[PDB]
Predict the 3D structure of the following.
Amino acid sequence: KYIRLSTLYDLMTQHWHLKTPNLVISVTGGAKNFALKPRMRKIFSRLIYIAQSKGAWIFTGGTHYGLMKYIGEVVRDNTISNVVAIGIAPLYCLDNNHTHLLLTTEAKVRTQLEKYISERVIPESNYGGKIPIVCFAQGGGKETLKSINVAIKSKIPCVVVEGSGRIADVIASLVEAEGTLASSCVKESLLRFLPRTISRLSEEETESWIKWIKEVLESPHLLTVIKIEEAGDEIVSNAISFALYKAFSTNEHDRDNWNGQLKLLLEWNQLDLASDEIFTNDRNWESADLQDVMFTALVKDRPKFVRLFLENGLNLRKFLTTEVLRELYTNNFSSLVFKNLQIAKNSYNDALLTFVWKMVEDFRRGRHPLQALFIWSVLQNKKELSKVIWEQTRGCTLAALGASKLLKSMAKVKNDINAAGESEELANEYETRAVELFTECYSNDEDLAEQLLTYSCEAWGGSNCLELAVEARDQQFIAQPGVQNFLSKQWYGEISRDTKNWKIIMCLFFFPLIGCGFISFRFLYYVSFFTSPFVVFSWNVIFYIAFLLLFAYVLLMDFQKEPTALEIILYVLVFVLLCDEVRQWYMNGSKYFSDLWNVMDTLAIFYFIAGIVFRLHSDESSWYSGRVIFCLDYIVFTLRLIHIFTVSRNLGPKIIMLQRMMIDVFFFLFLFAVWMVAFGVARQGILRKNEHRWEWIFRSVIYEPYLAFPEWITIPLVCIYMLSTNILLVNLLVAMFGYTVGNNDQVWKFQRFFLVQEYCSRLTIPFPFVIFANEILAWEAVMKENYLVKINTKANDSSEEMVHRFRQLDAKLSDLKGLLKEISSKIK
Amino acid sequence: EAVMKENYLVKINTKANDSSEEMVHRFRQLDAKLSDLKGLLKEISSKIK
Amino acid sequence: QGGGKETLKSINVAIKSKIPCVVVEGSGRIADVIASLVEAEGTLASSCVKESLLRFLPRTISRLSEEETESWIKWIKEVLESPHLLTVIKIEEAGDEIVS
Amino acid sequence: EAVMKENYLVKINTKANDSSEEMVHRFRQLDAKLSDLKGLLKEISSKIK
Ligand SMILES: CC(C)CCC[C@@H](C)[C@H]1CC[C@H]2[C@@H]3CC=C4C[C@@H](OC(=O)CCC(=O)O)CC[C@]4(C)[C@H]3CC[C@]12C
Ligand code: NA
């Protein structure tokens, strides 16, 4: 949009586009030669994204050269994600990337434009109104120094310089000094950095450059320098906001209006500036009007200011009212994560997620409120902000684990794998946040720690800290030596673990040996003995062994025609071994039958009742058919006993090698039985009874290989006998090393934990008797307060980077020249 | 993709942190400030005689 | 650790009457004044007090009468008479066991 | 074995190399030499007036 020039604001901000909540000015002029360094393009591309986040205008020289060409390429590429680049200008080629072009006699409406903008009060009023202006200067020469004085002296826009240029490095080096307003220190410099420029024209304009700099350094509170040693991220935001704050602070009317300077420093991210110049206690504030600033410090994603307002005094359990919490979930809860929650609730349903999905619903519909703000910041992956709200929670061994479940149950939703990936790495540093918070709680009194593991929590998720870890599969928390000691103290029960291993077993046989000092547990010690799950599991093996020796005895000597007294006890003991399975039919959820060995125990009893049905029929055809499906069930009641010994010896590091291998041979024998059906058909289809068919053939083809003309066809038959023995032997050896593929220390201790806690979830009564059946938290606050001090003590290896140890040398080196130039002045 | 490209080309030349953590230029800027002393301290004695 | 009127009063009435020790740290308004005023000699700080004390706390001095602001010179010149009763907890004691 | 013992007890207290490679005392001896300046440079201005 060309406009020839020789007020402007009305036809271009009402008929064309929006307002301008920021306005950056890059003063370069038509310098065709410009070294866009990889640092100089870092400044003027972070600036475009900052201006995109604020919706600014960029006034620059509208020509197709230098930085002004590089600027226009970034505004072209960033109108797809609201910067408007207004350009003001042999003949220079025009930059074909400025959406509104404003073509000596033209750098006077540029000054007339910005002063009309800088005066223009707007009732949004975050910078006291008055539309913040920055003037970025980086070049050298005539028009650069002119554009600083006509900026600074007429009205007040800030100027920002960097350490790369001809005259920008002059003013970058002329701020750590005093030179009587630099009436003779200008020519001391300005030929060291630009010697060719001074010998071009008249001295009366070179004399004027002294005046052009003495009007600049009158106000050094409007000139921020971007040094070279700001060699990190966020250096343009640390320079604009540091410049904009100076022009705000020196209005001499915001001493009462300190609240304007806080929302300015909150619109940007200036923690170190706000903590030193606003929250420094020589100013009078009350810390009760901080509440509308805190509500914007959350929803505008300021995780560093929410820590600042809390450490400056803010009762968060009194700030978090219910209308404040519903302004978060209804307005400031992002719809993408909320639609991610519905898919998280349906396909992976859990008691925790039903509590959270109820919580987001009735907060979007209509107490422990601090445990609801922590949910708000952990759902949307506020990674630095949820670490701050976690530090205020009443019980933090719990809430670090429960948030680790809320992330990991949403880290499996594959709608956005990045958000499901950031939730996975955030939950790992809540596992790690809850490991060391527990080992510090376990390096102290261990009985005091284990009461916290089984706390009722007043229904945070309704679960304890230990049960929240096993459902979330937090392998780092459960494999620590604190919890694995607690299980071994639980599985041995009230018996001490220092007796021996065999010393308990020599007391199961002989009941008078418990009453002696032969067991060293901790009046009627037998109830403590026969309720610890070591002796419960030790009873249900020697009873199960003695079950089989009277199942074998009734199958050889007895079992003539009458179900005698030895079989009636064999009837009811199977029913005793059945009446716990109807309680194993409880707490199953149709997935505890998905281990392929609880079902073989349940199909064992269902194969036994058919032997009872076949028994009391008095005919010899079903009596012998009742003996045979008793004898085949004798194998299954041994394969349960063998599977007991298989697990209970290799319960340890070999529990991940086993039961991954067990499915791998379950797959291999399935591929064997598929091949035996194939080899049966190729045997039935060759030998006789060729067409002699009934439903005989549907049952003979299976069992017939188990009991067991060449014109050119015998040579592929052995090639089949090479191809068939390959693909079965390969599956045999793949089953041999399926455990190998796939932090190996933590993964077996959790699998060791999950099996014993499945057996600790059993009733802790022996087998024949199954038919018969808030000031402790004041101690964890000290362990909590020592830990929160410890995680902010951790800046040792950050401070071993001696860039502040070199900076305190620089303060002591600045102590020299500030105090040594005064030594020479008292001599003359 | 040009913005993702331009953020990346800035990033690969931003990477001089562990090169600049070698403080041989942080010692060199001390040497410039130490050269600021002797260039400006020998002139203190000359105005006394 | 603090700043203001009653903090500087509670040091002089400590030190001058009998001898309890005082311990300051590098975080505060007037505590950082006395933290920075131990590596120096200023003729008992009769004119070096106002060289500081507005750099660290500028709003505090423009509140009341000069005759009590003149007294703050006396309130500090009685403090730095005995620098053997005033230990400073510096920021660069960034480890364990710094209070002991 | 007392000589092999005495060389070893010296050796385990010799081991403060990687502790002393943390140059916080090498910066502290600069601070003593920087405190040597201001203790001896304010007296230069007082003999001129
Ligand atoms: C004389 C005949 C007829 C009876 C033989 C008795 C055994 C069948 C019993 C008595 C001793 C028992 C064992 C005693 C000690 C334990 C250790 C235990 O290993 C664990 O540490 C469990 C994991 C844990 O929670 O720490 C597993 C079961 C086991 C082998 C018991 C399994 C069955 C055993 C061998
Ligand atoms: Na075969």
Notes: Chain C is about 35% helix and 10% strand. The pocket of sodium ion (ligand 2) is lined by residues A 724-725 (CB under 6 Å).
